[PDB]
Amino acid sequence: SMEQVAMELRLTELTRLLRSVLDQLQDKDPARIFAQPVSLKEVPDYLDHIKHPMDFATMRKRLEAQGYKNLHEFEEDFDLIIDNCMKYNARDTVFYRAAVRLRDQGGVVLRQARREVDSIG
């Protein structure tokens, strides 16, 4: 149908906007601490601590399969990156500190993205 196409164009445009959002969030992680999944070869107990791992490469695969229906689902994944880190790692660690700075800096980007998603519809 023509509606299904219209729908698919909106999703495609949401994916376009979310791709730009993802690039902006990932620039706030210049150390690349959150770039890839925590290695289960290197942290073999990880899944005993963290039940839903997440990282920027994993978000990117979901994004490119247009697997985010709305900004809320995208934010959920970004929040997992931060929140998982802040639980697994202690406060005095470069990892925890990196998460705090990504959260703080990402806030600005996410604030505008929400306005843009509501605005463009």
From Swiss-Prot:
There is a cross-link at residue 41 (Glycyl lysine isopeptide (Lys-Gly) (interchain with G-Cter in SUMO2)). It comes from the Eukaryota. It is found in: Nucleus; Chromosome. Residues 9-113 form the Bromo domain. Highly expressed in testis. Scaffold subunit of various histone acetyltransferase (HAT) complexes, such as the MOZ/MORF and HBO1 complexes, that acts as a regulator of hematopoiesis. Plays a key role in HBO1 complex by directing KAT7/HBO1 specificity towards histone H3 'Lys-14' acetylation (H3K14ac), thereby promoting erythroid differentiation. Component of some HBO1 complex composed of KAT7/HBO1, MEAF6, ING4 and BRD1/BRPF2. Component of the MOZ/MORF complex composed at least of ING5, KAT6A, KAT6B, MEAF6 and one of BRPF1, BRD1/BRPF2 and BRPF3. Interacts (via PHD-type zinc finger domain) with unmodified histone H3. Interacts (via PWWP domain) with dimethylated and trimethylated 'Lys-79' on histone H3. This is Bromodomain-containing protein 1. It comes from Homo sapiens. The gene is BRD1.
